[PDB]
Amino acid sequence: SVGFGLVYNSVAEAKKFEPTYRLVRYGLAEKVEKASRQQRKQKKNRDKKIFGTGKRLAKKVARRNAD
Amino acid sequence: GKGKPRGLNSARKLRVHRRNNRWAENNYKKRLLGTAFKSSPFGGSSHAKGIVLEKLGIESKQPNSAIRKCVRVQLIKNGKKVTAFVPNDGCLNFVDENDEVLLAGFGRKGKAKGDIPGVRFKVVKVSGVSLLALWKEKKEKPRS
Amino acid sequence: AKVHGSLARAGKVKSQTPKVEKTEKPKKPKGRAYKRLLYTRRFVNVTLVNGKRRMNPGPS
Amino acid sequence: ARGPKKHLKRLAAPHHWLLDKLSGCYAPRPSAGPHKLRESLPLIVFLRNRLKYALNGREVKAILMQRHVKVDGKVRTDTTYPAGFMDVITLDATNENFRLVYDVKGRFAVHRITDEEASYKLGKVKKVQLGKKGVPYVVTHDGRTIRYPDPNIKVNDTVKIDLASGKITDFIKFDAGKLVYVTGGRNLGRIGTIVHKERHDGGFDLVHIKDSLDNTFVTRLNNVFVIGEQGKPYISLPKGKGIKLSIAEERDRRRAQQGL
Amino acid sequence: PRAPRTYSKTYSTPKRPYESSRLDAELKLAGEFGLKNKKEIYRISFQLSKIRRAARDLLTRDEKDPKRLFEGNALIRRLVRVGVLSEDKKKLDYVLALKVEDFLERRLQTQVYKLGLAKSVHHARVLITQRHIAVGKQIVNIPSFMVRLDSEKHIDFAPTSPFGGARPGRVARRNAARKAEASGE
RNA sequence: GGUAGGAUAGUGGCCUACCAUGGUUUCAACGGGUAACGGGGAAUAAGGGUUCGAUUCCGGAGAGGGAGCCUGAGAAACGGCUACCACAUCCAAGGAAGGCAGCAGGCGCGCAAAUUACCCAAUCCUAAUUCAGGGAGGUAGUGACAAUAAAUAACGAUACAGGGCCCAUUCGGGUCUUGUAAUUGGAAUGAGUACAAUGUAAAUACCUUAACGAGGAACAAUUGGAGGGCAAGUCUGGUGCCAGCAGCCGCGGUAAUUCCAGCUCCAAUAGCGUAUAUUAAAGUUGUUGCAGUUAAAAAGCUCGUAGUUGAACUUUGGGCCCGG
RNA sequence: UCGGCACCUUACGAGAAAUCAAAGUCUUUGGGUUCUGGGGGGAGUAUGGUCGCAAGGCUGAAACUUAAAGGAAUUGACGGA
Ligand SMILES: [Mg+2]
Ligand SMILES: [Mg+2]
Ligand SMILES: [Mg+2]
Ligand SMILES: [Mg+2]
Ligand SMILES: [Mg+2]
Ligand SMILES: [Mg+2]
Ligand SMILES: [Mg+2]
Ligand SMILES: [Mg+2]
Ligand SMILES: [Mg+2]
Ligand SMILES: [Mg+2]
Ligand SMILES: [Mg+2]
Ligand SMILES: [Mg+2]
Ligand SMILES: [Mg+2]
Ligand SMILES: [Mg+2]
Ligand SMILES: [Mg+2]
Ligand SMILES: [Mg+2]
Ligand SMILES: [Mg+2]
Ligand SMILES: [Mg+2]
Ligand SMILES: [Mg+2]
Ligand SMILES: [Mg+2]
Ligand SMILES: [Mg+2]
Ligand SMILES: [Mg+2]
Ligand SMILES: [Mg+2]
Ligand SMILES: [Mg+2]
Ligand SMILES: [Mg+2]
Ligand SMILES: [Mg+2]
Ligand SMILES: [Mg+2]
Ligand SMILES: [Mg+2]
Ligand SMILES: [Mg+2]
Ligand SMILES: [Mg+2]
Ligand SMILES: [Mg+2]
Ligand SMILES: [Mg+2]
Ligand SMILES: [Mg+2]
Ligand SMILES: [Mg+2]
Ligand SMILES: [Mg+2]
Ligand SMILES: [Mg+2]
Ligand SMILES: [Mg+2]
Ligand SMILES: [Mg+2]
Ligand SMILES: [Mg+2]
Ligand SMILES: [Mg+2]
Ligand SMILES: [Mg+2]
Ligand SMILES: [Mg+2]
């Protein structure tokens, strides 16, 4: 079997230069509990509709369509 | 001196004469005038789908004595009416009145084949279920 | 060129042809072993070499 | 269309970068800089595809953002920085200094140099002009502007640039007898000094160059870089001394140097 | 957008589909060498067509031409190395005289039979295909392998894959397990 | 085309003013057609050629159609705006919003073309930026577009072909078994199934590998043919100028080598057939390289302009040296 | 002797042959140049243009159809030769 090997000078430099997926493979980084890519893109495009923080938008909606 | 000009500066006369005389061939004439896209019911295509209008019985040319079992077909893409031979024993029982046939050419690029007068096309599929497969045992024709 | 011949007989001979099922037989080998079988029947142990050779002799 | 292109297709990259055909649709487009797009070598091609020090482009970025590399004295943390001919790349770790010179097949070879030779570079004078307030300058082949040159410095000469201050130490004229390194065309990477120079008013002055095995070749004047006098070049020379052996001599050498 | 992937057809069919002489000759070839197909003859004919066309355009070049010497010597060296052209006979007008049987003799399926080890070409084919014979210590299961005259001494049975040792084998193990089931323990 | 001006980033009839009468064209202008984006290239060809190039790279143009513009270094931008035209969506009828020739997907059109998947790990790009973003791109799915390699068996004993020995005399002798016993024996292996590992961003698949995994090894190879061209049948049954076949020549009207079948045989083979287009074959476009008395074809005859073509002639010879 | 209308013999040669001193000097294929033809029909038709008083001329297709049409010679058969 033929492959490629890296031995870093220390484990701090291993964590610093080693890619995140290899550190997840070796146990030196946790896999992130991120969302799917289409959900992330849809959330971003939803946030593109809002200008400002939107607290005034939420309070104006809850004022106009409650009575 | 063999009729054509030979000189080093006669390439204009040679090429213009070749361009003029090239028109006398069948294929160059047909390709350059766009005959397949103006004439030729299969308007440049290899196959064409059409709707069966009628089952015809064509009497074969002499010295052959047979009825040839063709169909009259209106092409869907074009509206032109063509006559198409239904090739095998039986297989005119498989067509129907008024359903869908895929048609192809008939071997000789125009130019009706054999003893069959005026028929330049054959039926390849009917109802999209392939007359060879219908004829052997392979697939069953859909009822609707 | 008459286009209204009778279509009553379409399929006549194939519809009245007697049905014979294909005879069940041993399989023939495929590929390299079939070309091996062809080579033994044609160039190694051929005996029907009347004139040059024959391949499908009928009853004489 | 509509503005400057920012991408470079692979198979539209220069052939001397020796990029593999597969493993990407895109080649690293060289940034604007001292050298041209096609006459140069990006730092990612030098650090990943020549020295093999990095496996990715992300490792080239991780090397460069630690300020280890420097081109011509300054640090250059740009990944696609156009390092071209005569440029000196200093990698501080392993104390390596490189001068980008052509090997005689026409490609940028890895040529390790010393710290003395890394102190300077050579620049072919592209123009000599007066700037404003009457100050004269020369413009070299790598976009450097050097004020107050020697008045003997003309076009197609070669100045030596001190690279700690961008100053002209000495210079070499263009006249019959002195070495020529060839930096373009199909004689790219060759050496051999002279036969003469023919003028051709209107365009494309030609130089006849005859190497140490007495093979003449003509090159355009714009592809001609003076590196010194005949013997003792002002730079070190790469593996081969710019000879361009033919393919039979190449095979007669390669069969020899594999059976010990 | 990507680099296109180059591919080439490796054979040519004859222009005449039914010639009794050619069909007899190719069935004779496939019986002598144990071939699956006419395609395996057509590939060798394609390779000879390319070799002969290359040697022909070199032979019309004047002798002591640089391209003639370089490419002709490279062609001769490749054919000598693969064993089709002998270790004498290093001329371009003798590689025009090459035929199909020379390449068919150099196959791994022919070499495995020729160097003992197989007892037939049809046994050689199914020794090779069945992950037996190793050419270095490399298992090859390709019968069209073109043994290169310095691998001939190293063609043997594999370190794995019995007839080479280190384990009995699938139906031997099952049958011995059945005889252990029946007879003893 | 000249002069001057205006405009432009700048040259310029680019526009304007005033002049002059030019500019192009049988060496094909101008006009018409193109089922024309151009090129690198592709198929095929002894050589010369013929045909194709929407399509991975390069250049151009476009973003339903036209036009106009803002911003900006750069756009006459369309995942920017404005108007008109066409089409079309929501609506409380007041109004408001639109542009898949991006990716996926749908409808329609048709002979004719795939998932509303996963990811920025690679290649690169952009940003204030090592970090974010990227349907660019990559990964898989669908995929007989095309291409590469090559399973579907192999080997022995019981039976028989004879190539035989010393004149096997009449078959024994330590002969020598390829075809036949829908016999007989054990071996071999991957298709598949999967422990794991490796793979990979994560997977899948490959490669490796534990245990499984063939006797009708049903773990059953097909597609076209069997008159000629053109390899393979005057075999049997059916039909009886019908039905049908047949590229072409032809077969069928009661013994069909050709139809429909069965048996057997042939060819290519995980492929094979059909239709169309094109190349070779085609020296049937002929420059190489056709033909013109009679097969198609010397203008009725002569003049004549462009075109094509056009007699001979001008420093030859001798000697010497270096010299690859 | 030059020039002309031709003829006769031979086949060096040419041709599919009849025949041909040109229909030769052609696969051993290039002296110069013009025009014409590309299987048979449809068809010298339709249409457009142009000339003519007109009759017509000159230029001139296609759809569609077809497996031969033709040339020369041989043998036969036939002829109100
Ligand atoms: Mg001339
Ligand atoms: Mg015989
Ligand atoms: Mg663009
Ligand atoms: Mg860039
Ligand atoms: Mg194994
Ligand atoms: Mg002015
Ligand atoms: Mg002006
Ligand atoms: Mg003016
Ligand atoms: Mg002009
Ligand atoms: Mg177009
Ligand atoms: Mg193109
Ligand atoms: Mg194109
Ligand atoms: Mg188009
Ligand atoms: Mg645009
Ligand atoms: Mg649209
Ligand atoms: Mg901006
Ligand atoms: Mg726009
Ligand atoms: Mg859009
Ligand atoms: Mg855009
Ligand atoms: Mg789409
Ligand atoms: Mg894409
Ligand atoms: Mg399709
Ligand atoms: Mg879909
Ligand atoms: Mg990425
Ligand atoms: Mg996409
Ligand atoms: Mg199978
Ligand atoms: Mg394995
Ligand atoms: Mg049959
Ligand atoms: Mg035959
Ligand atoms: Mg037949
Ligand atoms: Mg030819
Ligand atoms: Mg002809
Ligand atoms: Mg005639
Ligand atoms: Mg005539
Ligand atoms: Mg005349
Ligand atoms: Mg004249
Ligand atoms: Mg002259
Ligand atoms: Mg002759
Ligand atoms: Mg013709
Ligand atoms: Mg004709
Ligand atoms: Mg008329
Ligand atoms: Mg006659």
Side-chain angles (χ1 to χ4, degrees), chain B residues 8-30:
Chain B
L8 266 194
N9 302 328
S10 80
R12 174 173 294 116
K13 172 67 70 77
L14 286 175
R15 185 179 67 189
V16 164
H17 188 258
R18 179 52 61 246
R19 206 165 64 224
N20 289 359
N21 285 268
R22 194 96 194 270
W23 281 111
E25 318 168 73
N26 300 342
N27 275 321
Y28 177 82
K29 185 70 165 290
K30 186 179 289 293

PDB file of all heavy atoms in Angstrom, chain B residues 8-30:
ATOM      1  N   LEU B   8       0.706  28.672 -64.712  1.00  0.00           N
ATOM      2  CA  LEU B   8       0.856  28.897 -63.278  1.00  0.00           C
ATOM      3  C   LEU B   8      -0.115  29.921 -62.721  1.00  0.00           C
ATOM      4  O   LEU B   8      -0.373  29.911 -61.518  1.00  0.00           O
ATOM      5  CB  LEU B   8       2.275  29.344 -62.940  1.00  0.00           C
ATOM      6  CG  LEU B   8       3.284  28.287 -62.522  1.00  0.00           C
ATOM      7  CD1 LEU B   8       4.487  28.968 -61.924  1.00  0.00           C
ATOM      8  CD2 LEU B   8       2.680  27.325 -61.529  1.00  0.00           C
ATOM      9  N   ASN B   9      -0.661  30.799 -63.554  1.00  0.00           N
ATOM     10  CA  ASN B   9      -1.566  31.824 -63.069  1.00  0.00           C
ATOM     11  C   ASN B   9      -3.015  31.552 -63.439  1.00  0.00           C
ATOM     12  O   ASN B   9      -3.843  32.461 -63.368  1.00  0.00           O
ATOM     13  CB  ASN B   9      -1.129  33.198 -63.562  1.00  0.00           C
ATOM     14  CG  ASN B   9       0.277  33.540 -63.137  1.00  0.00           C
ATOM     15  OD1 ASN B   9       0.737  33.124 -62.080  1.00  0.00           O
ATOM     16  ND2 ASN B   9       0.966  34.314 -63.957  1.00  0.00           N
ATOM     17  N   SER B  10      -3.358  30.305 -63.754  1.00  0.00           N
ATOM     18  CA  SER B  10      -4.700  29.951 -64.197  1.00  0.00           C
ATOM     19  C   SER B  10      -5.536  29.283 -63.107  1.00  0.00           C
ATOM     20  O   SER B  10      -6.516  28.593 -63.414  1.00  0.00           O
ATOM     21  CB  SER B  10      -4.616  29.050 -65.422  1.00  0.00           C
ATOM     22  OG  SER B  10      -4.343  27.724 -65.037  1.00  0.00           O
ATOM     23  N   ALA B  11      -5.192  29.501 -61.838  1.00  0.00           N
ATOM     24  CA  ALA B  11      -5.955  28.906 -60.752  1.00  0.00           C
ATOM     25  C   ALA B  11      -7.349  29.495 -60.615  1.00  0.00           C
ATOM     26  O   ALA B  11      -8.249  28.790 -60.157  1.00  0.00           O
ATOM     27  CB  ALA B  11      -5.213  29.047 -59.429  1.00  0.00           C
ATOM     28  N   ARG B  12      -7.560  30.737 -61.055  1.00  0.00           N
ATOM     29  CA  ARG B  12      -8.899  31.313 -61.031  1.00  0.00           C
ATOM     30  C   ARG B  12      -9.822  30.601 -62.007  1.00  0.00           C
ATOM     31  O   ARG B  12     -10.934  30.206 -61.644  1.00  0.00           O
ATOM     32  CB  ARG B  12      -8.838  32.798 -61.363  1.00  0.00           C
ATOM     33  CG  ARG B  12     -10.198  33.454 -61.494  1.00  0.00           C
ATOM     34  CD  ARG B  12     -10.054  34.939 -61.654  1.00  0.00           C
ATOM     35  NE  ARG B  12      -9.502  35.545 -60.451  1.00  0.00           N
ATOM     36  CZ  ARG B  12      -8.329  36.163 -60.400  1.00  0.00           C
ATOM     37  NH1 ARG B  12      -7.582  36.263 -61.486  1.00  0.00           N
ATOM     38  NH2 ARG B  12      -7.909  36.680 -59.260  1.00  0.00           N
ATOM     39  N   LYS B  13      -9.360  30.418 -63.248  1.00  0.00           N
ATOM     40  CA  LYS B  13     -10.126  29.701 -64.257  1.00  0.00           C
ATOM     41  C   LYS B  13     -10.350  28.252 -63.862  1.00  0.00           C
ATOM     42  O   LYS B  13     -11.458  27.735 -64.032  1.00  0.00           O
ATOM     43  CB  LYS B  13      -9.410  29.794 -65.603  1.00  0.00           C
ATOM     44  CG  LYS B  13      -9.977  28.950 -66.732  1.00  0.00           C
ATOM     45  CD  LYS B  13     -11.345  29.393 -67.183  1.00  0.00           C
ATOM     46  CE  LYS B  13     -11.298  30.722 -67.900  1.00  0.00           C
ATOM     47  NZ  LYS B  13     -10.787  30.594 -69.284  1.00  0.00           N
ATOM     48  N   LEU B  14      -9.335  27.606 -63.276  1.00  0.00           N
ATOM     49  CA  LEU B  14      -9.483  26.220 -62.843  1.00  0.00           C
ATOM     50  C   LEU B  14     -10.489  26.078 -61.707  1.00  0.00           C
ATOM     51  O   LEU B  14     -11.345  25.186 -61.741  1.00  0.00           O
ATOM     52  CB  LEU B  14      -8.126  25.656 -62.437  1.00  0.00           C
ATOM     53  CG  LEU B  14      -7.183  25.334 -63.592  1.00  0.00           C
ATOM     54  CD1 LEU B  14      -5.854  24.901 -63.064  1.00  0.00           C
ATOM     55  CD2 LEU B  14      -7.753  24.269 -64.488  1.00  0.00           C
ATOM     56  N   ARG B  15     -10.449  26.978 -60.722  1.00  0.00           N
ATOM     57  CA  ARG B  15     -11.360  26.857 -59.591  1.00  0.00           C
ATOM     58  C   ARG B  15     -12.786  27.257 -59.962  1.00  0.00           C
ATOM     59  O   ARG B  15     -13.742  26.626 -59.499  1.00  0.00           O
ATOM     60  CB  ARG B  15     -10.851  27.695 -58.421  1.00  0.00           C
ATOM     61  CG  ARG B  15     -11.672  27.531 -57.168  1.00  0.00           C
ATOM     62  CD  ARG B  15     -11.156  28.348 -56.014  1.00  0.00           C
ATOM     63  NE  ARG B  15     -11.300  29.779 -56.250  1.00  0.00           N
ATOM     64  CZ  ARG B  15     -10.774  30.709 -55.466  1.00  0.00           C
ATOM     65  NH1 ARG B  15     -10.086  30.353 -54.391  1.00  0.00           N
ATOM     66  NH2 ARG B  15     -10.947  31.991 -55.748  1.00  0.00           N
ATOM     67  N   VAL B  16     -12.949  28.278 -60.806  1.00  0.00           N
ATOM     68  CA  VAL B  16     -14.278  28.688 -61.248  1.00  0.00           C
ATOM     69  C   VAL B  16     -14.902  27.616 -62.132  1.00  0.00           C
ATOM     70  O   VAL B  16     -16.096  27.311 -62.008  1.00  0.00           O
ATOM     71  CB  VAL B  16     -14.194  30.061 -61.950  1.00  0.00           C
ATOM     72  CG1 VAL B  16     -15.427  30.367 -62.770  1.00  0.00           C
ATOM     73  CG2 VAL B  16     -13.996  31.146 -60.928  1.00  0.00           C
ATOM     74  N   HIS B  17     -14.097  26.991 -62.999  1.00  0.00           N
ATOM     75  CA  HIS B  17     -14.590  25.893 -63.815  1.00  0.00           C
ATOM     76  C   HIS B  17     -14.971  24.685 -62.972  1.00  0.00           C
ATOM     77  O   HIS B  17     -15.988  24.038 -63.251  1.00  0.00           O
ATOM     78  CB  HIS B  17     -13.541  25.522 -64.856  1.00  0.00           C
ATOM     79  CG  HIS B  17     -14.015  24.525 -65.862  1.00  0.00           C
ATOM     80  ND1 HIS B  17     -13.675  23.192 -65.810  1.00  0.00           N
ATOM     81  CD2 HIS B  17     -14.816  24.667 -66.944  1.00  0.00           C
ATOM     82  CE1 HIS B  17     -14.237  22.558 -66.824  1.00  0.00           C
ATOM     83  NE2 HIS B  17     -14.938  23.430 -67.524  1.00  0.00           N
ATOM     84  N   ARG B  18     -14.196  24.379 -61.929  1.00  0.00           N
ATOM     85  CA  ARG B  18     -14.574  23.284 -61.045  1.00  0.00           C
ATOM     86  C   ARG B  18     -15.839  23.601 -60.259  1.00  0.00           C
ATOM     87  O   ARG B  18     -16.674  22.714 -60.064  1.00  0.00           O
ATOM     88  CB  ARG B  18     -13.418  22.936 -60.109  1.00  0.00           C
ATOM     89  CG  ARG B  18     -13.688  21.812 -59.096  1.00  0.00           C
ATOM     90  CD  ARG B  18     -14.241  20.535 -59.732  1.00  0.00           C
ATOM     91  NE  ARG B  18     -13.311  19.971 -60.699  1.00  0.00           N
ATOM     92  CZ  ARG B  18     -13.533  19.882 -62.005  1.00  0.00           C
ATOM     93  NH1 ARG B  18     -14.682  20.275 -62.529  1.00  0.00           N
ATOM     94  NH2 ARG B  18     -12.603  19.366 -62.784  1.00  0.00           N
ATOM     95  N   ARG B  19     -16.009  24.849 -59.828  1.00  0.00           N
ATOM     96  CA  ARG B  19     -17.218  25.252 -59.117  1.00  0.00           C
ATOM     97  C   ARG B  19     -18.448  25.154 -60.005  1.00  0.00           C
ATOM     98  O   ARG B  19     -19.514  24.719 -59.552  1.00  0.00           O
ATOM     99  CB  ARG B  19     -17.051  26.676 -58.607  1.00  0.00           C
ATOM    100  CG  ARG B  19     -17.862  27.011 -57.397  1.00  0.00           C
ATOM    101  CD  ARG B  19     -17.344  28.271 -56.786  1.00  0.00           C
ATOM    102  NE  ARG B  19     -17.524  29.393 -57.689  1.00  0.00           N
ATOM    103  CZ  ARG B  19     -16.599  30.314 -57.917  1.00  0.00           C
ATOM    104  NH1 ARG B  19     -15.430  30.237 -57.305  1.00  0.00           N
ATOM    105  NH2 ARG B  19     -16.847  31.307 -58.755  1.00  0.00           N
ATOM    106  N   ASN B  20     -18.318  25.558 -61.270  1.00  0.00           N
ATOM    107  CA  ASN B  20     -19.427  25.459 -62.211  1.00  0.00           C
ATOM    108  C   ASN B  20     -19.778  24.008 -62.508  1.00  0.00           C
ATOM    109  O   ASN B  20     -20.956  23.647 -62.557  1.00  0.00           O
ATOM    110  CB  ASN B  20     -19.095  26.195 -63.508  1.00  0.00           C
ATOM    111  CG  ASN B  20     -19.070  27.709 -63.353  1.00  0.00           C
ATOM    112  OD1 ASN B  20     -19.313  28.221 -62.265  1.00  0.00           O
ATOM    113  ND2 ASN B  20     -18.742  28.427 -64.422  1.00  0.00           N
ATOM    114  N   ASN B  21     -18.774  23.162 -62.721  1.00  0.00           N
ATOM    115  CA  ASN B  21     -19.053  21.790 -63.112  1.00  0.00           C
ATOM    116  C   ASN B  21     -19.432  20.910 -61.941  1.00  0.00           C
ATOM    117  O   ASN B  21     -19.996  19.834 -62.155  1.00  0.00           O
ATOM    118  CB  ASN B  21     -17.852  21.204 -63.834  1.00  0.00           C
ATOM    119  CG  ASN B  21     -17.722  21.735 -65.223  1.00  0.00           C
ATOM    120  OD1 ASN B  21     -18.238  21.159 -66.170  1.00  0.00           O
ATOM    121  ND2 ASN B  21     -17.061  22.864 -65.354  1.00  0.00           N
ATOM    122  N   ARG B  22     -19.147  21.353 -60.715  1.00  0.00           N
ATOM    123  CA  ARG B  22     -19.525  20.615 -59.518  1.00  0.00           C
ATOM    124  C   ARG B  22     -21.036  20.502 -59.371  1.00  0.00           C
ATOM    125  O   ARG B  22     -21.530  19.539 -58.779  1.00  0.00           O
ATOM    126  CB  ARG B  22     -18.909  21.315 -58.310  1.00  0.00           C
ATOM    127  CG  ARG B  22     -18.895  20.541 -57.041  1.00  0.00           C
ATOM    128  CD  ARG B  22     -17.608  19.835 -56.807  1.00  0.00           C
ATOM    129  NE  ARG B  22     -17.769  18.856 -55.740  1.00  0.00           N
ATOM    130  CZ  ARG B  22     -17.569  19.111 -54.454  1.00  0.00           C
ATOM    131  NH1 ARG B  22     -17.187  20.317 -54.067  1.00  0.00           N
ATOM    132  NH2 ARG B  22     -17.745  18.156 -53.558  1.00  0.00           N
ATOM    133  N   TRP B  23     -21.780  21.444 -59.957  1.00  0.00           N
ATOM    134  CA  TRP B  23     -23.236  21.479 -59.890  1.00  0.00           C
ATOM    135  C   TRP B  23     -23.910  20.320 -60.610  1.00  0.00           C
ATOM    136  O   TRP B  23     -25.105  20.096 -60.401  1.00  0.00           O
ATOM    137  CB  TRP B  23     -23.742  22.788 -60.494  1.00  0.00           C
ATOM    138  CG  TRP B  23     -23.614  23.951 -59.580  1.00  0.00           C
ATOM    139  CD1 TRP B  23     -22.775  25.004 -59.719  1.00  0.00           C
ATOM    140  CD2 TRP B  23     -24.349  24.179 -58.376  1.00  0.00           C
ATOM    141  NE1 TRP B  23     -22.931  25.873 -58.677  1.00  0.00           N
ATOM    142  CE2 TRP B  23     -23.897  25.390 -57.839  1.00  0.00           C
ATOM    143  CE3 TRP B  23     -25.342  23.476 -57.702  1.00  0.00           C
ATOM    144  CZ2 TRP B  23     -24.407  25.913 -56.659  1.00  0.00           C
ATOM    145  CZ3 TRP B  23     -25.852  23.999 -56.535  1.00  0.00           C
ATOM    146  CH2 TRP B  23     -25.384  25.204 -56.023  1.00  0.00           C
ATOM    147  N   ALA B  24     -23.194  19.598 -61.468  1.00  0.00           N
ATOM    148  CA  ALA B  24     -23.784  18.510 -62.230  1.00  0.00           C
ATOM    149  C   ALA B  24     -23.871  17.206 -61.452  1.00  0.00           C
ATOM    150  O   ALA B  24     -24.487  16.259 -61.945  1.00  0.00           O
ATOM    151  CB  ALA B  24     -22.991  18.283 -63.512  1.00  0.00           C
ATOM    152  N   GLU B  25     -23.267  17.124 -60.272  1.00  0.00           N
ATOM    153  CA  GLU B  25     -23.426  15.948 -59.434  1.00  0.00           C
ATOM    154  C   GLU B  25     -24.721  16.030 -58.641  1.00  0.00           C
ATOM    155  O   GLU B  25     -25.236  17.108 -58.356  1.00  0.00           O
ATOM    156  CB  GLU B  25     -22.254  15.792 -58.476  1.00  0.00           C
ATOM    157  CG  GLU B  25     -20.943  16.077 -59.112  1.00  0.00           C
ATOM    158  CD  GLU B  25     -19.824  16.210 -58.118  1.00  0.00           C
ATOM    159  OE1 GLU B  25     -19.392  15.184 -57.552  1.00  0.00           O
ATOM    160  OE2 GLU B  25     -19.363  17.344 -57.913  1.00  0.00           O
ATOM    161  N   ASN B  26     -25.240  14.859 -58.279  1.00  0.00           N
ATOM    162  CA  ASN B  26     -26.516  14.784 -57.580  1.00  0.00           C
ATOM    163  C   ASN B  26     -26.395  15.260 -56.140  1.00  0.00           C
ATOM    164  O   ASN B  26     -27.212  16.067 -55.678  1.00  0.00           O
ATOM    165  CB  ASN B  26     -27.034  13.349 -57.615  1.00  0.00           C
ATOM    166  CG  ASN B  26     -27.255  12.848 -59.013  1.00  0.00           C
ATOM    167  OD1 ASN B  26     -27.346  13.630 -59.959  1.00  0.00           O
ATOM    168  ND2 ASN B  26     -27.326  11.531 -59.163  1.00  0.00           N
ATOM    169  N   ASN B  27     -25.364  14.793 -55.437  1.00  0.00           N
ATOM    170  CA  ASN B  27     -25.224  15.061 -54.011  1.00  0.00           C
ATOM    171  C   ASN B  27     -24.866  16.512 -53.726  1.00  0.00           C
ATOM    172  O   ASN B  27     -25.380  17.094 -52.770  1.00  0.00           O
ATOM    173  CB  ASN B  27     -24.173  14.136 -53.409  1.00  0.00           C
ATOM    174  CG  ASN B  27     -24.743  12.801 -53.012  1.00  0.00           C
ATOM    175  OD1 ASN B  27     -25.856  12.721 -52.497  1.00  0.00           O
ATOM    176  ND2 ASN B  27     -23.985  11.739 -53.248  1.00  0.00           N
ATOM    177  N   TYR B  28     -23.978  17.098 -54.527  1.00  0.00           N
ATOM    178  CA  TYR B  28     -23.589  18.490 -54.328  1.00  0.00           C
ATOM    179  C   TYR B  28     -24.750  19.430 -54.620  1.00  0.00           C
ATOM    180  O   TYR B  28     -24.961  20.403 -53.891  1.00  0.00           O
ATOM    181  CB  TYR B  28     -22.397  18.813 -55.219  1.00  0.00           C
ATOM    182  CG  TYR B  28     -21.909  20.240 -55.191  1.00  0.00           C
ATOM    183  CD1 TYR B  28     -21.070  20.686 -54.183  1.00  0.00           C
ATOM    184  CD2 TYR B  28     -22.296  21.144 -56.176  1.00  0.00           C
ATOM    185  CE1 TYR B  28     -20.610  21.980 -54.171  1.00  0.00           C
ATOM    186  CE2 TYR B  28     -21.853  22.438 -56.165  1.00  0.00           C
ATOM    187  CZ  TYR B  28     -21.013  22.850 -55.161  1.00  0.00           C
ATOM    188  OH  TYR B  28     -20.568  24.144 -55.153  1.00  0.00           O
ATOM    189  N   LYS B  29     -25.504  19.147 -55.688  1.00  0.00           N
ATOM    190  CA  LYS B  29     -26.705  19.908 -56.018  1.00  0.00           C
ATOM    191  C   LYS B  29     -27.723  19.832 -54.890  1.00  0.00           C
ATOM    192  O   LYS B  29     -28.227  20.858 -54.421  1.00  0.00           O
ATOM    193  CB  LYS B  29     -27.298  19.364 -57.319  1.00  0.00           C
ATOM    194  CG  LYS B  29     -28.486  20.087 -57.923  1.00  0.00           C
ATOM    195  CD  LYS B  29     -28.073  21.427 -58.460  1.00  0.00           C
ATOM    196  CE  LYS B  29     -29.099  22.053 -59.379  1.00  0.00           C
ATOM    197  NZ  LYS B  29     -29.199  21.324 -60.670  1.00  0.00           N
ATOM    198  N   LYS B  30     -27.977  18.618 -54.392  1.00  0.00           N
ATOM    199  CA  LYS B  30     -28.977  18.428 -53.348  1.00  0.00           C
ATOM    200  C   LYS B  30     -28.541  19.033 -52.020  1.00  0.00           C
ATOM    201  O   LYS B  30     -29.377  19.561 -51.278  1.00  0.00           O
ATOM    202  CB  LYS B  30     -29.276  16.938 -53.210  1.00  0.00           C
ATOM    203  CG  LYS B  30     -30.399  16.591 -52.261  1.00  0.00           C
ATOM    204  CD  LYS B  30     -30.629  15.105 -52.205  1.00  0.00           C
ATOM    205  CE  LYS B  30     -31.249  14.630 -53.506  1.00  0.00           C
ATOM    206  NZ  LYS B  30     -32.625  15.155 -53.699  1.00  0.00           N
TER     207      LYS B  30
END
